[PDB]
Amino acid sequence: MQIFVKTLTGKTITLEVEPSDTIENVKAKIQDKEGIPPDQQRLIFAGKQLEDGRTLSDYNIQKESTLHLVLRLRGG
Amino acid sequence: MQIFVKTLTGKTITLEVEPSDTIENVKAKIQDKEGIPPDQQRLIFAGCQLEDGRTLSDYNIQKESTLHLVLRLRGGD
Amino acid sequence: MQIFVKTLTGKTITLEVEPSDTIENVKARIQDKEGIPPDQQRLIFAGKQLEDGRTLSDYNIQKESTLHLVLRLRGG
Amino acid sequence: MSSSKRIAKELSDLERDPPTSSSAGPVGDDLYHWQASIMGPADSPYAGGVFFLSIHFPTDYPFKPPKISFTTKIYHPNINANGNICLDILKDQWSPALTLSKVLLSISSLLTDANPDDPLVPEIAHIYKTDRPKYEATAREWTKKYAV
Amino acid sequence: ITGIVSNVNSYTDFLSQIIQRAILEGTALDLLNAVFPTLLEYCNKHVSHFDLNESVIYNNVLTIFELFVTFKPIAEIFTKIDGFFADYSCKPQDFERKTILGPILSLSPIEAAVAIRNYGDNLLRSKQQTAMIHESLQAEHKVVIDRLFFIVDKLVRGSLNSRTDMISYFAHIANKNHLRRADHPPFKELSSNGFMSNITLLLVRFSQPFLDISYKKIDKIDANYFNNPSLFIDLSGETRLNSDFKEADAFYDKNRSKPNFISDCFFLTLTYLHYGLGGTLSFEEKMGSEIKALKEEIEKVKKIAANHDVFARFITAQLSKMEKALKTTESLRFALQGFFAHRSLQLEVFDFICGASTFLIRVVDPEHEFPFKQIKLFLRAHAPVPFKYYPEFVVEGPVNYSLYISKYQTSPIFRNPRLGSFVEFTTMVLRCPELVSNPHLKGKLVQLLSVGAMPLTDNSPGFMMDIFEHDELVNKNLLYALLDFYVIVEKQFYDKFNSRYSISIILEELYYKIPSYKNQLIWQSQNNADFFVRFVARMLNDLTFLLDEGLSNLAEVHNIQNELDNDKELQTRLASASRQAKSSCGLADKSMKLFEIYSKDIPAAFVTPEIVYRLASMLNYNLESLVGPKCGELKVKDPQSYSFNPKDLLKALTTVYINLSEQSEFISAVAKDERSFNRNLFVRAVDILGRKTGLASPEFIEKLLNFANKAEEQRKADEEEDLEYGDVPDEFLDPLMYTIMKDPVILPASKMNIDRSTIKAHLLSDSTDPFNRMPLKLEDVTPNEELRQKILCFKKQKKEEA
């Protein structure tokens, strides 16, 4: 499934998904180009979090919906 | 890159680091030029004490940063 | 022929050499008894930085001279 | 101009719609120091406990996240003895659009899930990653100590 | 051998020819291998402590070297003695016992047993009784120093081989002892301070010819000394000024060149400055706390009765070894001060520093003509090359010695005309940040300048004020540097204000006594405006919470104190609560005092729209804490200790209003700060100033009451505008401000309306949209003229009934 995700400085990437994927299976096709940790998988989709441990079948991402990948600076 | 470590005696040392290097690997350098074993070497960055399992790929990327050296000593009264 | 090599820490070592030896082979002999890798090693004769592919007779090095080893500065 | 009517509006809508297991308000007639009050989630050892909050808005509040700490002593890894709260949106994830009610939703949410990878206490994070019988016990233990 | 040591003045002619016997025979080095190890044998074992106390004995031994070192054919070959150099595996404490040069360098009054000999007989001698102990030894110390310098000079001038050897002899000592700079060094494993201090003096006295006051021999020292790797000073691990390792290791590789004893002896001196005395001065400074910790240990034990026979003798002997240990440390702290007060030695050291300062400015000079023509005054790539690759102990070494020694009234820095070379260097560092990128190094430089600019007890100008006035380098650019460096030191973080406490003293004193800086000021306010506003905005912003932190810790001092009104880690935090409140109560006064003097003369600077909203907020909130219950109920024990004197601070705070009182914008500002405005606040401050008699004039109050009345008639007219605009349509409200938009602009990302000024404060913090986290710039906006026409229309609708 062609879905979209965009970074801070304007960069967006293209990848595939499935309706029965998970949010880390979204992430499983995110470190295949950048190499980022799934603990830093940060999704800002209309003011709320998209939680990583859930599946893709709860977070209403439609055909070529744009996500927002910012890297995390967690800790304290 | 290189970062700063400031002790509580008003002494400032610098230390060149790699972001792959662990907190233990940081403590082993400061071990040699301060004569202190790394068990006694407690660190504070932005208020949060670091973890021995962590690295410098874990806490707040920037060069020219500055840690603090809180000296927990083995013995009390 | 034997030569003397001096360190920044002041270690004095002997070394059986030949005037046509390459300097990395000399640095291999330094690694042979002290294990220090040759890219790290850096030798001085007559106040001059040396070159690996040259020989001792290129640098006019008489036997039982003094060499100076600088461990090139390792990082953190 | 800058500060007051933003604060009074968020006060007014909580007076319109009070939160269910939470409640918050100012400490008397000082607008810049409030008091919140929550109850623990039923799916937690934090259930049965009531917790009070020390709140200080800054003078650039609508543009700086506030300084807010707990009053009650709690057995929690993301809370120190000072009641400081290692929470993400209390830091550079701040947006000025955020309401304090929605902030208070995040607080019990941290009491719900307890994200351990920001270990504000080292020892409790090791206990939580090893033995749930030790963690879930002492939280209800210090509830009966403090949060009654 | 023994009677040769005992009766050295009788054998001195008889053994002279026997020395001369072997010179013409060439068998000289044979018996030299027999005498000096047996001399090392006789000093180590036949005497348990060959020291400075045995006034018979060491005076014999010095003359023995004086019997040899005169002979030019022997001093050229003196270095070949068995045990002349150390071992490769030698312990650093074991130099001074297994070396031919070992013991005679260690003759020093700062040895423990000498301090036991000369202090422990009475612990409370007076300040006059103190000094006669010193000059009894200090003049005897010069006999020790000058006779050694006669020996070592003939070793240098003996041959070409031998002056190489002493450089090699010293380098093996300094490199084994980098741990002297540590916080808690292994003193039983390092070299003694007496061994290190004596050698430190000798290299300075080598520098005296080519450190003359004519400064023409300054080109004898090579400025290109470090481009080439060092064969003697171990630079491995030594932090460079403005270069990392990998560029510097390339910088050895790039440009790929002979050694020179002139440049060799000079940089070695700074090592013995830093790793010698520089640890010794830190060694003395802690004995104020080392004694203080030791007395409390013994005080606990003396309340214990001793009965149990195994444990009674233990506790009895537990004190008695600490008795001598207290006798140890109290002897040594009194010993090191007079060594640091022996100004005849202390002059040569500071003479070396400013001469070396003259050297360093020559290096920074692109033409390298500094000692004749004056220098003309990202950061790493634009840095001058030779300089950026030098180590940091060439700066840290002097400034540690400078910060420490100014505690003495017998200061060799004081009334030295050669001082100004250092401040030329110190200004030049803080002027161009390309030279040193380290700020913590630059903090000890700016901490030093405040110490040189403190007014004394008699309120005389500080001992750099003449130098601040009469130095044509400094007066051009010291002002611009200090105002820049106040900004940068931003980069929890509880030391960033310690440096700002040091700057604000210097800003105050230069505003008082030097009128040209005041003239330079003002011109920087009027013609360097965008620079000076950042200094004002920075000093304003800190003060918003400095007073809050002082209220936070001084209660927490009591909270630790009342906990002991019923473990030591709270007492450890009690000092942490002390100084951080001291810095809170201190810097807030120093910040407030600068507003008093600047508003008096440049009020038109403070009335910019970017400050006038900010400033009135900071003044009112700081006012209510002082006059209100918060500082009043905070009853601090000895308020002059923390300098928590809000009665003194209030007079400044009210004056800031009065200085700004002729500006309608500042009057309009305070009435719009409803976070902390009230008429009663100033009225409270009247009778508070009515308590401190003579502290405020009645006219001073009357001007203030004139201000508050003009402020009060303003805000009543301001809420008069508020009452004629009640129920308001929701669409005309700024969705982050919840007020009426003056300049409604449309967000491009989230398509929302916002005021220009609202998102401007958001974009001054982050260039992202607050509503959908999209990237956003000020240039991205679109002004909504259409909505503001309805804002024009609807505001006129309530005017139709107003």
Side-chain angles (χ1 to χ4, degrees), chain A residues 4-14 16 18-19 21-29 31-33 35 37-38 42-58 60-62 64-66 68-70 72 75-76, chain B, chain C residues 1-28 30-73 75-76, chain D, chain E residues 1-58 60-124 126-131 133-141 143-179 181-192 194-197 199-307 309-331 333-384 386-391 393-489 491 495 497-499 501-532 534-680 682-696 698-773 775-802:
Chain A
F4 288 157
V5 55
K6 183 179 69 178
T7 66
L8 290 171
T9 56
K11 182 186 289 292
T12 182
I13 60 171
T14 58
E16 66 185 3
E18 289 297 324
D21 280 333
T22 58
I23 308 299
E24 72 274 20
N25 201 0
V26 179
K27 183 63 178 178
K29 293 174 182 291
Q31 58 260 6
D32 58 356
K33 184 66 178 177
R42 181 67 177 176
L43 278 308
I44 304 299
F45 184 71
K48 299 179 293 296
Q49 295 184 0
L50 296 180
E51 203 276 327
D52 188 75
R54 291 182 181 272
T55 63
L56 191 146
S57 66
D58 293 331
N60 66 18
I61 295 302
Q62 306 299 320
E64 287 90 5
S65 296
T66 299
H68 297 282
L69 192 274
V70 53
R72 291 182 180 180
Chain B
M1 64 184 179
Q2 61 184 359
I3 58 171
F4 294 151
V5 178
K6 185 172 183 177
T7 66
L8 297 177
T9 65
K11 183 190 183 69
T12 297
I13 61 172
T14 71
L15 188 60
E16 298 191 3
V17 293
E18 292 294 325
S20 65
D21 292 334
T22 67
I23 303 300
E24 180 186 3
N25 199 1
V26 170
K27 287 179 184 178
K29 295 180 182 297
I30 303 171
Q31 179 180 2
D32 187 77
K33 64 191 291 184
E34 295 294 329
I36 301 169
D39 56 355
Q40 297 175 357
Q41 297 173 355
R42 188 259 181 87
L43 292 171
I44 290 296
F45 181 72
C48 294
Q49 180 182 359
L50 305 179
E51 187 182 3
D52 287 330
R54 291 288 90 193
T55 60
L56 290 174
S57 63
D58 296 327
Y59 299 97
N60 208 167
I61 175 168
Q62 194 175 1
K63 71 178 177 66
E64 297 178 356
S65 297
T66 299
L67 301 182
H68 294 285
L69 185 65
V70 177
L71 279 74
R72 57 177 64 185
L73 273 75
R74 184 170 59 246
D77 46 286
Chain C
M1 63 181 181
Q2 64 180 357
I3 56 172
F4 290 162
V5 179
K6 191 175 182 180
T7 65
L8 291 172
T9 58
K11 189 173 175 66
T12 300
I13 56 172
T14 65
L15 186 58
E16 295 178 354
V17 292
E18 292 293 325
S20 67
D21 294 335
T22 63
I23 308 300
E24 185 175 0
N25 194 3
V26 177
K27 285 189 177 182
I30 302 167
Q31 194 181 9
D32 184 74
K33 69 183 291 184
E34 294 297 324
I36 305 166
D39 52 355
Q40 295 183 358
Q41 301 180 3
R42 190 167 182 173
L43 292 172
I44 304 299
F45 179 73
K48 291 186 289 294
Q49 181 183 0
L50 304 183
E51 185 180 2
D52 292 330
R54 299 289 91 193
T55 66
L56 302 179
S57 63
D58 291 330
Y59 288 157
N60 207 166
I61 301 168
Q62 192 177 2
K63 69 179 184 293
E64 290 184 353
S65 299
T66 300
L67 292 179
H68 285 282
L69 173 63
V70 173
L71 274 72
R72 189 178 64 189
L73 209 155
Chain D
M1 182 188 73
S2 179
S3 176
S4 297
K5 292 182 175 66
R6 175 63 184 267
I7 301 167
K9 203 267 189 296
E10 293 185 358
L11 186 145
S12 178
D13 293 333
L14 269 71
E15 189 175 0
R16 293 183 182 178
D17 288 329
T20 62
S21 67
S22 295
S23 179
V27 182
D29 290 331
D30 188 74
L31 187 63
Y32 289 82
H33 175 69
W34 289 11
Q35 177 182 1
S37 64
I38 59 171
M39 284 82 78
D43 52 355
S44 68
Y46 294 153
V50 179
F51 301 97
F52 289 162
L53 275 302
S54 179
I55 298 168
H56 290 89
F57 284 167
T59 183
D60 62 328
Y61 178 53
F63 295 156
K64 186 71 68 176
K67 180 69 176 67
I68 292 171
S69 175
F70 274 102
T71 303
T72 309
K73 298 299 294 296
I74 186 170
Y75 184 76
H76 188 73
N78 288 318
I79 296 165
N80 57 1
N82 301 115
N84 290 319
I85 302 163
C86 186
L87 188 59
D88 54 354
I89 60 169
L90 300 178
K91 202 169 259 74
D92 294 329
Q93 299 184 0
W94 174 256
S95 176
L98 296 176
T99 67
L100 184 59
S101 63
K102 187 64 70 177
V103 174
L104 264 292
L105 262 297
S106 299
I107 295 168
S108 64
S109 300
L110 186 59
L111 297 174
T112 303
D113 289 329
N115 207 164
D117 291 331
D118 293 333
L120 190 65
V121 180
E123 184 176 2
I124 305 171
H126 191 195
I127 295 167
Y128 184 74
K129 288 184 179 180
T130 53
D131 190 75
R132 292 288 186 90
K134 192 176 189 295
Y135 177 74
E136 187 178 359
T138 313
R140 283 191 290 269
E141 291 173 357
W142 292 7
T143 303
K144 293 184 285 186
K145 286 182 66 67
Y146 296 100
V148 293
Chain E
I1 301 299
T2 297
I4 297 171
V5 175
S6 297
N7 194 1
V8 71
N9 290 319
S10 297
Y11 291 101
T12 184
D13 292 332
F14 183 76
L15 295 176
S16 178
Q17 297 294 321
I18 301 169
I19 298 167
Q20 187 177 2
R21 187 73 58 83
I23 298 169
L24 295 175
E25 292 180 354
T27 181
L29 187 62
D30 295 331
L31 187 63
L32 292 175
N33 291 317
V35 174
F36 295 98
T38 303
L39 183 62
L40 185 62
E41 180 182 1
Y42 182 75
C43 293
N44 289 319
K45 300 296 288 184
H46 296 284
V47 176
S48 296
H49 296 88
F50 180 76
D51 58 355
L52 191 65
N53 289 319
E54 295 294 328
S55 178
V56 176
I57 295 172
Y58 69 93
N60 297 319
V61 176
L62 294 174
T63 306
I64 297 169
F65 291 95
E66 292 177 354
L67 183 62
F68 287 102
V69 73
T70 304
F71 286 163
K72 184 68 179 294
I74 305 300
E76 64 183 2
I77 60 169
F78 185 76
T79 62
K80 299 285 99 175
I81 296 171
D82 294 332
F84 180 74
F85 289 100
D87 292 331
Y88 176 71
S89 65
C90 184
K91 297 179 183 179
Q93 73 275 18
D94 291 332
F95 286 103
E96 63 183 0
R97 297 184 69 251
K98 293 183 184 293
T99 307
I100 305 300
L101 294 174
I104 61 170
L105 292 173
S106 65
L107 271 296
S108 179
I110 65 171
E111 183 65 27
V114 177
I116 296 169
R117 183 67 61 85
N118 292 318
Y119 292 98
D121 294 332
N122 190 1
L123 296 174
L124 293 175
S126 69
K127 297 292 184 181
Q128 184 177 2
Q129 291 178 357
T130 302
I133 303 166
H134 298 290
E135 293 180 354
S136 297
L137 296 174
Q138 288 178 356
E140 185 178 1
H141 189 195
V143 178
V144 176
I145 298 299
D146 292 331
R147 292 178 69 187
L148 289 174
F149 179 75
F150 180 74
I151 298 168
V152 177
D153 183 75
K154 299 294 183 182
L155 293 174
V156 171
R157 296 182 185 272
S159 68
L160 185 62
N161 291 319
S162 296
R163 65 174 60 88
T164 301
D165 292 330
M166 294 299 291
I167 300 299
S168 178
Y169 176 73
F170 288 158
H172 182 73
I173 298 170
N175 292 318
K176 292 286 187 180
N177 287 315
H178 290 170
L179 295 174
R181 319 304 276 105
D183 292 330
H184 297 286
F187 295 104
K188 294 179 182 179
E189 293 179 353
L190 295 175
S191 297
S192 66
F195 187 77
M196 294 300 292
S197 299
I199 301 171
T200 303
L201 297 175
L202 295 174
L203 296 179
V204 175
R205 191 173 293 172
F206 281 165
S207 297
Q208 295 177 357
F210 53 87
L211 272 299
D212 57 356
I213 64 169
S214 66
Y215 296 103
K216 293 181 176 66
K217 293 182 180 180
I218 192 166
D219 57 355
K220 294 290 182 68
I221 301 169
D222 193 2
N224 290 318
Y225 182 75
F226 290 76
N227 318 136
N228 57 94
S230 176
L231 294 174
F232 295 100
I233 297 169
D234 185 75
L235 295 174
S236 67
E238 296 294 328
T239 301
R240 308 296 175 90
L241 290 174
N242 194 359
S243 178
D244 57 354
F245 290 165
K246 294 184 264 74
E247 294 179 356
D249 292 331
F251 186 75
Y252 292 111
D253 291 330
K254 192 264 186 295
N255 291 320
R256 294 293 89 194
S257 66
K258 292 182 181 179
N260 290 317
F261 177 74
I262 297 170
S263 297
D264 289 329
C265 184
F266 179 73
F267 291 102
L268 181 61
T269 309
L270 295 174
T271 301
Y272 282 152
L273 181 64
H274 179 75
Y275 290 100
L277 295 173
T280 302
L281 61 87
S282 66
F283 176 71
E284 193 275 333
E285 186 178 1
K286 291 182 180 180
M287 287 184 180
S289 296
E290 294 177 356
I291 295 170
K292 184 175 175 66
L294 185 60
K295 289 183 180 179
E296 293 180 354
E297 293 291 327
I298 297 170
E299 184 179 1
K300 185 185 286 185
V301 178
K302 289 173 71 175
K303 294 182 177 67
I304 299 168
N307 289 318
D309 195 2
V310 178
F311 187 72
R313 295 179 294 172
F314 179 74
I315 298 299
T316 301
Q318 185 130 281
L319 295 174
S320 66
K321 186 169 74 70
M322 293 188 288
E323 291 176 354
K324 186 176 179 180
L326 184 63
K327 185 178 179 181
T328 300
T329 304
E330 290 179 351
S331 296
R333 189 183 69 188
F334 291 160
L336 295 173
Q337 292 179 357
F339 178 74
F340 290 153
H342 192 191
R343 186 174 178 176
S344 178
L345 273 68
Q346 300 293 321
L347 288 173
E348 292 180 353
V349 181
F350 184 75
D351 287 331
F352 178 75
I353 296 169
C354 292
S357 300
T358 304
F359 175 72
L360 294 175
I361 302 169
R362 184 177 176 87
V363 175
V364 177
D365 191 1
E367 294 294 327
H368 300 285
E369 206 62 21
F370 155 65
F372 324 89
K373 290 182 181 179
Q374 190 70 44
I375 193 168
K376 298 286 99 176
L377 293 175
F378 181 75
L379 295 174
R380 177 171 288 174
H382 296 90
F387 180 85
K388 64 183 287 184
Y389 300 105
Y390 287 171
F393 68 95
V394 303
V395 177
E396 182 179 359
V399 71
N400 286 321
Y401 185 77
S402 296
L403 285 170
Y404 176 73
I405 203 67
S406 295
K407 68 184 288 183
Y408 294 100
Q409 186 64 42
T410 64
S411 178
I413 298 172
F414 182 75
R415 65 184 185 272
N416 191 0
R418 292 183 65 191
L419 198 161
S421 297
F422 189 79
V423 180
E424 286 175 351
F425 178 75
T426 303
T427 303
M428 182 177 69
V429 175
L430 297 176
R431 179 66 180 87
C432 295
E434 61 180 358
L435 296 176
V436 175
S437 66
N438 189 1
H440 294 282
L441 183 64
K442 293 188 286 186
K444 287 184 179 180
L445 292 175
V446 70
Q447 184 178 2
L448 183 64
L449 296 176
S450 66
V451 177
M454 289 181 184
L456 293 174
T457 303
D458 57 355
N459 298 113
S460 65
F463 56 87
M464 294 181 184
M465 294 298 291
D466 185 77
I467 301 167
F468 290 159
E469 182 177 2
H470 296 88
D471 194 356
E472 293 178 353
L473 182 64
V474 176
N475 58 6
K476 293 181 183 292
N477 290 319
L478 182 62
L479 181 62
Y480 180 75
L482 293 173
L483 295 176
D484 193 2
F485 185 75
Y486 189 82
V487 175
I488 311 166
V489 294
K491 293 171 70 175
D495 323 316
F497 302 103
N498 290 318
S499 296
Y501 177 73
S502 295
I503 298 170
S504 297
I505 298 171
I506 302 167
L507 295 173
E508 183 177 1
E509 294 293 326
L510 295 178
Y511 189 79
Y512 286 166
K513 295 181 177 66
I514 296 171
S516 67
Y517 292 166
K518 184 175 179 179
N519 294 318
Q520 292 151 41
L521 293 174
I522 306 167
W523 182 67
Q524 291 294 107
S525 68
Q526 293 178 356
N527 295 113
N528 202 168
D530 289 330
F531 179 74
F532 180 73
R534 188 181 68 187
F535 175 73
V536 176
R538 180 71 270 169
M539 184 178 71
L540 189 151
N541 214 329
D542 295 331
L543 188 59
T544 62
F545 67 98
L546 293 175
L547 184 61
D548 293 332
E549 181 65 28
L551 293 174
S552 178
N553 290 318
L554 289 173
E556 187 67 28
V557 171
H558 295 89
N559 292 318
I560 298 169
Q561 182 61 255
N562 294 117
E563 186 68 27
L564 278 74
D565 290 331
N566 55 5
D567 193 0
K568 66 179 290 295
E569 192 272 332
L570 293 174
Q571 184 177 1
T572 303
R573 290 177 62 89
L574 191 151
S576 178
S578 297
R579 292 189 298 273
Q580 191 67 40
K582 180 180 176 181
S583 178
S584 298
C585 297
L587 180 59
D589 185 74
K590 299 293 183 182
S591 298
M592 189 65 71
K593 185 70 175 177
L594 292 176
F595 285 100
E596 183 179 2
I597 59 171
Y598 291 163
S599 63
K600 178 67 177 177
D601 292 330
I602 50 170
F606 295 96
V607 298
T608 62
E610 61 187 359
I611 301 299
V612 66
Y613 293 103
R614 297 291 301 275
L615 180 60
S617 179
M618 186 275 289
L619 296 175
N620 294 320
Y621 178 71
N622 288 317
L623 181 61
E624 290 183 350
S625 297
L626 299 176
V627 299
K630 293 173 71 176
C631 293
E633 294 178 354
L634 182 62
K635 184 63 68 178
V636 294
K637 276 75 176 175
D638 193 0
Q640 297 294 322
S641 297
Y642 292 98
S643 296
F644 180 75
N645 293 318
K647 299 177 178 66
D648 293 331
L649 183 61
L650 180 62
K651 179 70 176 178
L653 181 61
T654 59
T655 306
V656 175
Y657 292 103
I658 297 170
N659 291 319
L660 296 173
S661 64
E662 294 179 354
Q663 299 296 321
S664 66
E665 292 83 3
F666 181 75
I667 297 170
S668 179
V670 178
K672 294 181 176 67
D673 187 73
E674 69 272 15
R675 180 172 65 87
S676 296
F677 182 76
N678 190 1
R679 185 179 182 271
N680 204 166
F682 299 101
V683 178
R684 288 176 62 88
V686 174
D687 189 74
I688 296 169
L689 295 175
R691 290 182 180 177
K692 296 285 99 176
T693 61
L695 194 282
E699 295 84 3
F700 185 81
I701 298 169
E702 183 179 1
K703 291 181 181 180
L704 182 60
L705 294 175
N706 194 2
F707 178 74
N709 290 318
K710 290 187 264 75
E712 186 66 25
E713 59 87 20
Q714 180 66 41
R715 54 95 62 216
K716 292 183 184 293
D718 292 332
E719 58 87 19
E720 183 68 28
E721 190 273 331
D722 186 74
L723 58 86
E724 64 184 1
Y725 281 103
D727 47 284
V728 269
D730 196 2
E731 65 181 1
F732 294 100
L733 295 175
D734 193 359
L736 291 176
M737 296 299 292
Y738 293 155
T739 60
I740 297 94
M741 294 180 286
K742 293 181 176 66
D743 188 75
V745 299
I746 298 169
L747 294 173
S750 66
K751 301 296 186 291
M752 296 301 291
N753 292 318
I754 195 167
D755 192 1
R756 183 181 296 275
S757 65
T758 299
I759 193 66
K760 186 182 287 185
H762 181 75
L763 292 175
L764 186 62
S765 65
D766 191 0
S767 296
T768 59
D769 187 76
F771 289 164
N772 58 3
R773 300 288 292 165
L776 182 61
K777 291 177 70 67
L778 182 62
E779 293 83 3
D780 294 332
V781 304
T782 300
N784 192 356
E785 181 66 27
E786 188 272 332
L787 183 62
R788 189 179 65 84
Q789 295 299 110
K790 292 181 181 179
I791 297 170
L792 291 174
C793 183
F794 180 74
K795 288 182 180 179
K796 190 175 180 180
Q797 297 301 109
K798 298 294 185 290
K799 286 170 91 288
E800 292 176 354
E801 298 295 328

